[PDB]
């Protein structure tokens, strides 16, 4: 609390694409998805005010788990469906 889940993504990004088809539809909708509810952004724009986060974002797509303010933890690209339903649940857990 509050958890959101930034996800980072640019123009050409075929594995954001892939995210949007595959994972999005179902998020809200799933208990994780409404514990940390996703946001988008674009990783070349600058972050909205009072967002602090560990490091830049670099790759696309990065999916940031924020605790209020401060970023808890993140992933880093999309493998998989199965591959991105543990490892945010890793970061749910750890943010509390």
């Given at each position: 609390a509050e958890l959101r889940?930034?996800?980072f993504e640019q123009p050409g990004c075929l594995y954001c694409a892939r995210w949007d088809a595959e994972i999005a539809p179902q998020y809200p909708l799933t208990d994780e998805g409404r514990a940390a509810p996703v946001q988008r952004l674009q990783?070349?724009?600058p972050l909205p005010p009072g967002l602090e986060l560990a490091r830049p974002?670099?790759?696309t797509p990065?999916?940031?788990?924020?605790?209020?303010?401060?970023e808890s933890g993140r992933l880093e690209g999309y493998?998989?469906?199965?591959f991105f339903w543990p490892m945010l649940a890793r970061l749910i857990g750890q943010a509390e």
């Open positions: 889940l930034l996800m990783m070349r724009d974002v670099t790759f990065t999916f940031v788990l924020m605790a209020g303010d401060v493998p998989g469906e199965d």
